[model samples]
Every structure is written in structure tokens, then in C-alpha cells.
Target: MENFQKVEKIGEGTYGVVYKARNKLTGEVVALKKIRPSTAIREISLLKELNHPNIVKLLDVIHTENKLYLVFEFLHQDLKKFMDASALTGIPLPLIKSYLFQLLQGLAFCHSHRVLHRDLKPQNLLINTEGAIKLADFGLARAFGVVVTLWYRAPEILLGCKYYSTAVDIWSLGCIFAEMVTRRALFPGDSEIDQLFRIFRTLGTPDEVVWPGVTSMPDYKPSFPKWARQDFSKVVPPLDEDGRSLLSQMLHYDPNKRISAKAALAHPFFQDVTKPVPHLRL
Candidate 1:
């Protein structure tokens, strides 16, 4: 525990900052996430049990009086960093396909274990030397700070639903998929209310038809604009038909109707891009 030393701060998250560190003697490297998550015990326990190739692996837990340090296998960079650090301008469609598949595989494993990531973002997804982009920050995302990013939030959570299912992660994934394809956020909403409006203008305002509990949700308002669903292709002109179809199912208004990670892995859109563990060009 005392043998490892901090290398440098690599990135920031809703919980806290993470660092690139190395072992003093062995010269081994790892990511040390320094966090003060309100409920650290649950995050440790959850990390101890859940394991998957598409998910980040916990190497150790260094607990002290005021803070907790989570040790993990170090990956060089994250998806969003790569999204911006591309050779030309953006991640190509072929690259995006495999990355999407990997993310779903990771989610399937978590949801199958009755665990929801609760937080899914491009910055939390790591891409390494090979083409692999493993998911980071699982149960640790819960029991924490709330001055958080709202772009990837599902409508149910944004609407103040006191209860939810694993479907929330799918929404986050859908947003990331769109982001990867277009090189920008799918819903660049700034606040709770504005975020919902972004959803309505694109997916169309929810109702008893599209979303059974829309009227009953805590944040629902009758005065909101009734923006009919607009063309997705108009926003992401480069996305092909198969890609658009899968994106729609993922961003579906109703959580229940939203496709599961496992089902998404099997969608026809992924039929052509068959690498189960895709590597990155970066």
C-alpha cells in the first residue's frame, strides 16, 4: 500500500480526481482514484465482486482517515480524450461500431449481475494500446456528490423518478453512441428542465402513448412545448440506417422499451462489425 507513488493527475469526475501512479520498486503503473464518495463501503464491496473484460478491474483499496484511494489497472486514455485526440478530426464509423459493441458487452455483464453502472460517460470509458475501451467507475458513482453532469442522464432520472431500473445505463450508452458517431453530445442540455426539452425536441414529447408515466413524473409539466420528433439523421448525417435504427431504440422515450445491453449486442447494426473485443487505432 505504501509502496505505490502518485505520478500525476490524469482526469476529473463527479466523485473526485484520478491519478496515474507507479510502484516505487517494480516500476509498475496503475490508476489511483482519490475519492471521498459519501458511501465508500458500498463502492468497495461492489468493486470487490463485479469483474468483466469490458469493465475496469480493481487492484487494491487504500483507505485512510479522510479519503479512500481505489487502485486500478492503468489505461493510457479515455474515450472522450480519444474522441478529441483523433488523427484527423473524429472517430470513424468502423471504429465507433466496435466501441459500441464493447460498451454493451460491459453493460450486459453488469446488469446480468443485477448491478447498474448508474454513471456512464465517455470520460469514464478507457481506451488502451489495443482497440479495447473498457468501462470505468461502476458502483463508485453512487453515494456521492450531486453537482453532476446531466447530458447523459435518462429522462426518468432527470424527471426525478424515485425509482429506476438498469435501463438508465442504456440511456447513457445510447447518448455515448450518438456522441461517438457525431463527435459531440447527443443532448447538450445544461440543466434539468433544459435537458428534458432537448429530449422532447428530438425524441418528441412523451405522453401516455410514448411514456406511460410522463404526466406523473416529478418534473413533468403540462406547459412544456410539444415538439414533434425530428429527423435524427439531420443531426448525425454520417450515421447509416442501421446505426440510426439502433440509436432510436436506445434513446426510446420509455425505459422499458429501451433495448437492453445484451439485446443491443445482438442487433443487426452490429452484424457487420464482429470484433467482440475491439481495439483502438489510437
Candidate 2:
């Protein structure tokens, strides 16, 4: 804490308060994340092993007498704020393609190294003046990809099926993409079951043919009265044809049938991004 000066309070994170700070000696701007001792220890160990361009760079880790601090490269804003303040109803196709391409690049690296982001929401995606996207927050991130939180969680985990993989992150990418275009979360459920139903309502409920092992999941006991109800149109009513097709591949009910991050990058959605843009310099 004494090594750097806090410039501004960013916001509350999963287990900490983020602040913009400057290195006392070097005068470099950085984001300082203060964490509880318990969570700090865990995140430090995991974050030390992750490195990628689209992901926030971990510059330093500091441990104080009673707390832990994570130092990251400073960024001006996140995707949520960027989308809200940009004065655009829909993100320009070129920008969206750029962001999504970078996102997949980062996820591809994480997946190759066996790390799961776990949390993949817009708030975690930071954007610098250069228009570059950097994934932030690794507190909920872990080495194993077993647990899936509600809202953006993949269907395999929602159904409690043992079978799953990096495809889970792709599912989240799809949801985030939809939210980016429409500026609204496609599925916002009040509970885990409600969240699942929201997803089912949009994409159609999974059947034995689509997801064979769903019935045997540990939490597989039916919770909804009308589990057979399907209302796809109402769920994704706002998505356009192209958006719907791309989303369909990402939100596939069967994890096995879902598109891989590498494959998704090659999909026609990103055919226009033939080369990387120079680093964002805003």
C-alpha cells in the first residue's frame, strides 16, 4: 500500500476495492486491487500463472501486514461503461469484430494452458484509449472448470452434467456478444433455476437427444412445474438473423456440439478481421 499512491477508487470487485494508483518511484499508472487475506492468497497463486495480451497484465503482487494487493496495468474503462457512454445503440461492426477477435485470442491462450476464466461478463472486459480489450479480474477464475455461475453459465453446467470443457467460456462469449449488440443481458434470471429457464426459453429446452447425460446430474431433480415449456422466440426476440446464427453456435445445448474458441475465430463472424489492428492508443 505504501509503495504506490491511490489516484482514484475504481469500484467494488468480487473480493476487493479497485483503485487507480501510481507507482511512487517509477511514476507508472496502475490499478491496485486490495483483497482479503484469504482471497488474496488464492488469486495471487492463480494469477501468477496467467499471461495474455487481451487479458489484463499482472504487473506486481504486494503483501502487507494484514492485506494483499494486486497491481495491474491501468485502463480507463470497461466494456459496460464503454458501451453505455459511446452514444451508439449498437457497437460498430468493425469494433465488435476487433473486440471479439481479441477476446477469443485471449480465451484460446487460457484454454490451451488449461485455465478457465469462470467469470466472463462485460464488466470484466476493460478497454483502453486505443480500443483494445483487456480481460480483468481473476478472483473467481480457477484452474479447474467445474463450477458454473448462473446467468452466463453454460447449459452443461446448468444441467449439472459432468461433461464440459473450455466450451463453457465460449457460451459466455456468446451471451456477452448478444449483450454488447443489444445493450441488454439476454438472460437475467432471479435464481439458478430461473436463469436456466431464461436460457431455455430463448434457445429451447434441452432434450435427451441433445444432452444425454443431463438427467443424471447431481442437481438434476426437476425444479420447474412446466419443464416442457419452450419459448425460443420470446427469449431472443431482439437478435437479428446473423446474430442469432452466431449465438446458436455459441449457446448450443450440447457442450460437445458447441464451437471451440479457435473455430469460432474462424467463423464468418470474424472473416473481416484478416489482420490485427495496431495497439489501441486512445
Candidate 3:
């Protein structure tokens, strides 16, 4: 606590406050997150075990009698702020591809380690001036549990599938990808049921043929209005052919059918941006 000087309050949530701070010895800037006692254990342990360029780095942790502090590499802003600033002009296509590729790469790494980011929205995605994106905030993140946000949540979870997998994160990624292109949420619902309906309206009502055993879930209902599948192009007009194709795969109703983060990283949509460049000759 004595080694770092707090600069300013950066964020606040159900857990605790996050401060931008500077180390006294090195003068290195960092984001100091003061977490609630209840969430400290899970968030700290998970962050300690995970390390990737596209994921927020946890530098150190300090614990005292009554508090736990997590020191992280400071980032300039989050995706929400970045998007808000570009609301008038819209984000460039190349930048969107770069950001989404990084996001999927990070998510692929997490899934490979059997970790699940149950809550992944623009607010949880940190970005720097260099246009680099990193995933942050693990308060609701869990490897195996019933946890997710309503808007970005997968339909399987909405249907009461407790033992869900990384597919839930993919679903959120799909929503995020669409939002980034259109500058609006793909499914902004008032409640859980409304959220599911919003998704169904766009993708069409799912049946056993599309999502086998969907009705067997604890909460599945067959009385909802039948919505014809809407064209993905119309839904996200900014996206090109490749982008729409990838989005469709990721937004699949069946968890088993949805594209994995690893698979998405290899999609044709990212080929142009993700291709390796040849080294310059001396």
C-alpha cells in the first residue's frame, strides 16, 4: 500500500473501486483494483493462472487484515468508451477485424485452459491507444458454473442449461462482433425472457431439428411467436460476406454447433489481418 500512490478513480462496480496508481520506486503506472472480500479469491486465483497479450495482466496482489488489492497493467480505456467516441463516425473495418481477432485469440487461450469468461461485454474489454484490446474483470467469470449476462447470454443458458461450456462465451462474442460493426447491441432486452425472444426473432425460433433436445431443458417453452429467420446482412449491414458468415456460425442456437474460439481465429474473415508478414531483408 505504501509503495504505490493513487492517481485517480477509474471505475466502480459491485466488487469495489479501481484506481489508477503509480509505483513510488519505478514510477510505473498501474490499475489498482480494490476487490470485495467475497470475490477476491476467485478473481485473484484465476488472474494469477492466466496470462495472454489480449487479456489484462495482473502484476501483483496485496492483502491486509481487511482488504485485497490487485495490481494490473494500466490500459487507457475500454471498448465501451472507444465505441462511444466513434459513435458518430463508426469504427473502421480493418480495426474491427483486428480487435475481434485479438479478442478471439485471448478467448481461445482461456478455453484451452478450461476457463470460461461467463461475462464478456464491451465494458469488460480494455483497449489502449495502440488499438489493442484485452479482456478484463473476472468477477462473474468461472470455468464451470451457471453465470452469464442477459443480453450477451446464450439461449441454452436462458433455457436453464446449468452445465454449459465455453459456447456461452462464443455467444457473447457473436453479440459483441455484431455490435462492433453496427454500433448497437444485437440483443438489448429488458429481461431474460425478452432477451431470448430478441435472439429468436433474429435467428428464428429454434426447434428439435435446429437445436436437438432444446425443449428437454428445464425452462424451454413452445408457445412463443414463430419468427422467420431474418437475413444476417440486414441485421448487421456494416459486415461484409466473410464477417456475416463467421457471425452466423458463432451465433448458432446449439452449443454443440457454435464455432469455438480457436476455430473462429482461423475463419476466413480474419485471414487478411491475421496472416503472418515476411521479415524485412537486412
Candidate 4:
């Protein structure tokens, strides 16, 4: 704690406060999150085991008698703020694809490690001036938990599926991808039920044929409004065919049918950026 000087308050959540700070010795800027002991245990444990370029790096952890501070590599801004700034003009296609690629790459790494980010929203995604995106804020995230925002949460979770999977995060990515291009949330429902209804209205309500065993879930409802799936082109007018296809697959009703993060990375939508970049010999 003494080694770093707090610069400004960055954010505050139920568990803790985050401060932008500078190291006294190296002058390297970082984020210091003062978290509760319970939250600290999970965040530190998971972050220590995870390491990827698209994921926020946990530099160090400090503890006191009643407080825990997590030191992380500082990022300039969150995806939400960036999108808000570009609201009028909308995000460029190339930049959208690049950010989505980085997002999925990071998610694939987390899935490979058998972890689940339960919470995945734009505010949790950090960006730098170099156009780099990194996933952050794992306070409400856990391998097995029902912690997720309504707008970005998967339908299965909304219907009371306690044992959810990585598909939850994929659904969030789909929402985020749409928001990036349109500068508006794809499903901005006001409540849990409203969120579910919005999703059903957009993607169509799921049946046993569409999502086998969906009705078996504890809170499954059979009387919800049945909506025919809407055309992706109308929803995301700016996206090309490839982008639309990937987005549709990611937002599939059944978690089993939803595209995995690793599989998404291989989709044709990313063909241009996924290819190796050529280097020129001097």
C-alpha cells in the first residue's frame, strides 16, 4: 500500500473501490481495487491462474488486518465509455471486428481453463489507446454462480438454471457485439422477465424442438409469448453476412447449440483478421 500513490478514484462497486495509482519506485500506473476478503479470495485465486493478452493482468495482491488491495495493470477506458463517445458516428466495422476478436480470444482462454466469467458487460471490458481490449472486473464472476446482468444474461439463467456454463458468456458477447455496431443494447429489458421477453421477441421463443429439455428447467414457462425469429439484418443493419451469421449462432436459445468462444474465433467473420500478418524484410 505504501509503495503506490493513489491518483484518482476510478470505480466503486458493492465489494470495493478501485483507484488509479502509480508505483513509487517504477512510476508505473496501475489500478488498486480495495476489495472485501471474500471477494479478494476469489478474484486473486482466479486471476493468478489466468494469463492472456486480452485479459487484465493481476500484478500483485496486498492484505491488511481488514482490507485487501489488488494491483492490476491500468487500462485507459472501458468499452462502454468508448462506445458512448462514438455513439453518433457508430464504431467502425474494422474496429468492431478487432475488439470482438480480442474479446472472444480472451473468453476462449478462460473456457479452456474450465472457468466461467458469469458477468460479462461492456463496463467490465477495458481498452487502451492502441485499440487493445481486455476483460476485467471479476468480482461477481465465478466458475459456478448465478451472477449476471439481466441485459447480457443468458435465457437459461433467467429461467432458473443453477448449473449454467460458458454459453452464458457467449450470449453476453453477442449482445456486446450488437451494441458495438449499433451503439444501443440489443436487449435492454428493464427486468429479468422483461429481459427474457426481449430476447424471445428478438430471437423467438424456444420450444422443446429448439431447446430440448428447456421446459425441464426449474422456472421454465410454457405460456410466454411466442415470437418468430427476427431477421438479423434488420437488427444489425451495419453487419455483413459473416458477422450476422456469427452473432445469430452465439445468441442461440440452447446453450448446447450456441457457438463456443474458441469455435467463434474460427468463424469466417474473422477470416481477415485471424490470418497471419505479413512482415516486410528491411
Measured against the true structure, the TM-scores of the candidates, in listed sequence, are: 0.91, 0.83, 0.87, 0.89
- Which ten residues in a row are the worst by lDDT in model 2? 139-148
Error of 3 at 57 (Å): 0.6
Residue pairs with backbone atoms closer than 3 Å in model 3 (clashes):
none
Q: Tens-digit lDDT track for model 4 on 1-282?
A: 577898999887434788999999999999887764365465556566678989898787777666677788888888878888878777778788888999999999888877677778898898877678898754345521323357888899889888868899999999999999888999998889999899888888889999999889888777888899887799988788999999999998899999999999999998887322211111
Candidate 1 lDDT at 131 equals 76
Candidate 1: list runs displaced more than 4 Å: 37-39, 143-147, 276-282
Give the per-residue lDDT digits (tens) of candidate 1, residues 63-120: 7766677888888878877877763667767778888988899999988987777779
Q: Give the lDDT of residue 167 in candidate 2.
A: 82
Instruction: Compute the lDDT of residue 218 as modeled in candidate 2.
Output: 68
| lDDT measured at residue 282 in model 4 versus the true structure, 0 to 100 | 15
Root mean square deviation (Cα) for candidate 3: 4.9
lDDT of 3 by residue, 98-123 (tens): 88999999899878877777778887
Q: For model 1, what is the error of residue 6's alpha carbon versus the real structure, in angstroms, after optimal superposition? A: 1.2
Clashes of 4: 0
Ranking 2 against 3 by TM-score, winner:
3
Looking at model 3, report the run of 10 residues with the lowest lDDT sum: 273-282
